[PDB]
């Protein structure tokens, strides 16, 4: 239901979400400036940070890859199965199912019924408003503070180059005047020790965002549009695309460098009721954050059901041991 | 501080008017972890003190200054105490961007 | 009156000023994303009177209760006990609103993220009661984004704690109408959330020629007769 | 068909993936940056490592080899032929198969048809704007770290000089004034214990990437362009170009050097439907993690078959004891 | 210890000019010394060439050469035995192999 997940991995030799360099022969990876102690002084570091937007499409493509298998995946949009997802528009108020059906955008049941994606991941249709927020959301990838306060000086970004040789009918060869293609570009490759943190609101799939609870029986029950089964089914597939992120499955140029995976730690916390996020792993000291605020949800009268990945997470708290994300997906998936 | 002097000398491995192109005995030294890479590195690169000397004799410009033998103990007299990497890796790049300076050596 | 502190880390937020391609993050979040973040709370917690039909009708419904039970319509504020600084994404935030480009145009978006590493940021509450002075603590937590959804934030503690009156310099921001009475940094942060006004406030970081890029400080403004206190250490606030 | 292969490789005095140009002097072979522990904190470690896109390469130069002795051999582009790994420039509108016919390159579905290079690994045509991602995925060979924390850094290369003897038809070896060529260059040759990792999507061979299914029984029936026996063909001329692979085809400088192989241990799995990636070789705890991946994939619903060489994974559940890479690619071609 | 410098400036007899003694392969061998047997050995076949370089140096107007004092064997032998290391074994072998070449003013 409602899951939220935190932690640190390792992954070295990967240019993922780079500037795209379309304009110039120089690729430049992407940078963000961090501050951070340096012994009694607040000092700023330009370290390479993947962006949410990659890990939301890449848990999309995830999703939608295995929301095929399923008998019910045909309740799918057509840009779903081609990895689009730019979601309609000013200009769009029809969608085009995967077998070809048009679907009205009127009020946002009949969307989340007809479509798997929009239900997920949200939607916008100009028209008429019928905003529906994603349901899953994602912060950037930093490597810890930890780790930039034990490095203090090095790059740990290598500019490396790869050229594109065109032997031409017999056996030549040109640079810019026989209008062949044999040029000499560059990529940047990040290492380090990365933090992650992603909230999966699961709890709301298959209910129209306008109407939580019906309450027409004097019972506030959920306001369900859809078949039971199939939500299930929808829960299930969007807990499943986790797997096919933390093994090597985020970011860009993955054909040439399929980034050297190994999560290191996790926390992650499952409820069937709202509940909060716990803290961010590019922190130092968010083992010790994370022991403070679930001791404090369960002081209020929550019932979270914890799991964690190389972490203590000290011994009081009846907490879940992990031998790996699989093993998690497969104890979240007893829901 | 005795770094001019060996300084110089490791300079003598890169120059274009000495044509031998030693850069692996340069970047040895520059990427030393600890004591000992750091040491074989030295040494390697003390080495080919009588090629050097044999290549600027029968050139003509003057010969090379090895690094006399008072500045050779302080090298292992200040690198015991060097325990920590983190000191280590400051003279082992400073040697190396010495080693990387003009020095003009034959006019 | 029973004023609520909650502290947030959080990487970064991009909550944006009012312009095109360009979306410059605010400095310091502005009062309506601050009081729509517990309005979140509020229609989610006890949905019973506060949700209707309409999303924004309930959220419209939430805010109108909450600014009830406020001292003035410019209470909220936010205190950088951490350095901020802005770094900028050029993301594929496609371009699909505007008239024309159908729904396959995609072009380089420029947006500008606020990195700091915690905020603690205080809603002044004026006699609520107990009962639901409960749902609000509840409330207080759980304020999991701010403006854009990719801006996490995890509320790592919020309580109740009384100003008890000291005299401190001011930390937490202010309006710009107490700081002229007794280094100038005046912004317009539309304190009411816009739905189908604009108030001045002074803003509480200096510039520091620290570092290549020039980032985020202190400044102290005069004593305010009004004060609270965290873990020992006194900071300004100010209430009409 | 989706498999993945995950390992470690001896491999020493071998000056694959160099830097520098044949021309210039002193050339460098590449160097990548790792992490590591060494007892302590976060360290990185500059070490001689292949780029991912040498490996890409050399099996899109495999590949070719194995399915030019194919029937289907003519549904090849004239450039894979040459070994030509530029599908597709900027500023062309049309491609020349390998028997000299010419293809339009307007939809994805015939460019997937009629090429068989352009399809299994992808390819871009900026000029009409269409795409194909590659269906193989390579990662970097990089030392593994138990081994890089082992040896302390003792730089691991050995550049070695050696020269031509250009000299003149009278004997005498000349000047740059005379003409001659007779210089000294440098090479750089690496040594270690390596890991590799390369992922194969090859269930989407033969599917346009735009319409991978066509509901003509309103059941997700896939959209396969080509015959069944050619897309079947295409899957072993893949999975045999890996023999070539793990042999000593993946470097540069194979005339000179030719480096010395010997696989010393992998994993490989495959379960004809979405899986998981392994774990890279390169870290020295990677068999205990594939053995939970693998574990926890099949308790939660996965029928993945595992092929381990060298390597005692759990000894309790279902994995065959290869006993070299071939015999790995009979077993994976076996259960297409 | 004060020996090292003892050593090597023995050492160094071997590799200088004035000397036509060029062994380089002993100071190499020395200087790769993985093991204690082989390092021992190395010292052994360095010592031995002592007479050649004794007579020479006064067959040719020069001061004749230090060549280590038993005490310096003594605390060679006592370090050989107690560090059976190689990591400490690699940099102790360096550290008299290093001295080998320098700017040394043998002859005046």
Known sequence: MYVRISGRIRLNAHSLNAQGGGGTNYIEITKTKVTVRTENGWTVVEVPAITGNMLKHWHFVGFVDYFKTTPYGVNLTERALRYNGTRFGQGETTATKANGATVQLNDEATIIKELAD??????????????????????????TEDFIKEVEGERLITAIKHNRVDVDEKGAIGSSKEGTAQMLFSREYATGLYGFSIVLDLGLVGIPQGLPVKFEENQPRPNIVIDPNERKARI??????????????????????????????????????????????????????????????????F??????????????????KVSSVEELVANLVKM | ????????????????????????????????????????????????????????????????????????????????????????????????????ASWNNCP | MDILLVCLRFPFFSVAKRSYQVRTSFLLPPPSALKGALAKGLILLKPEKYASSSLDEAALKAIKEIESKLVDIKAVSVAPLSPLIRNAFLLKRLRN????????????????????????????????????????????????????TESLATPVWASFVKPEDKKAPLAFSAPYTEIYSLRMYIEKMRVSPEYSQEEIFYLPIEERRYKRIVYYARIYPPEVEKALTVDGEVLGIWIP
């Not at chain 1, 408003?129 to 950037?140: M, T």
């Not at chain 3, 915690?118 to 304020?143: G, H, P, R």
Request: aromatic share 10%.
């Open chain 2, 1 to 100: 501080g005795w770094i001019r002097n060996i300084g110089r000398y490791l300079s003598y491995l890169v120059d274009d008017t000495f044509e031998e192109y030693a850069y692996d005995v340069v970047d040895g030294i520059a990427k030393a972890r600890t004591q000992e890479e750091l040491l074989e590195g030295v040494y390697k690169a003390l080495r080919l003190a009588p090629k050097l000397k044999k290549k600027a004799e029968s050139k003509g410009c003057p010969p090379p200054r090895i690094p006399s033998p008072e500045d050779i103990e302080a090298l292992e007299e200040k690198v015991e105490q060097l325990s920590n990497p983190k000191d280590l890796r400051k003279l082992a790049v400073s040697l190396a961007l010495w080693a990387f």
């Open chain 1, 118 to 143: 929009a239900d997920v991941h949200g939607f916008l249709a100009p028209k008429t408003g019928r905003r529906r927020v994603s349901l899953v959301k994602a912060s950037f990838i930093l490597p």
């Open chain 1, 236 to 301: 299930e597939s969007a807990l499943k695309a986790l797997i096919p992120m933390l093994s090597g499955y985020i970011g860009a140029n993955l054909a040439r460098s399929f980034p050297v995976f190994k999560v290191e730690e996790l926390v992650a916390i499952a409820s069937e009721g709202p509940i909060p996020a716990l803290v961010h792993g590019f922190y130092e000291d968010y083992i010790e954050a994370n022991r403070s605020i679930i001791k404090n949800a369960r002081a209020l009268g």
């Open chain 1, 303 to 320: 019932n979270i059901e914890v799991f964690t990945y190389n972490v203590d997470l000290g011994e009081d708290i009846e907490a879940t």
């Open chain 3, 97 to 148: 609103l505007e008239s024309g480009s159908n729904a396959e145009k995609s072009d380089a978006m420029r947006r500008e993220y606020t990195f700091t590493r915690e905020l603690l940021v205080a809603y002044i509450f004026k006699n609520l009661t107990q009962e639901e002075k409960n749902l609000y603590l509840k409330a207080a937590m759980l304020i999991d984004v701010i403006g854009d």
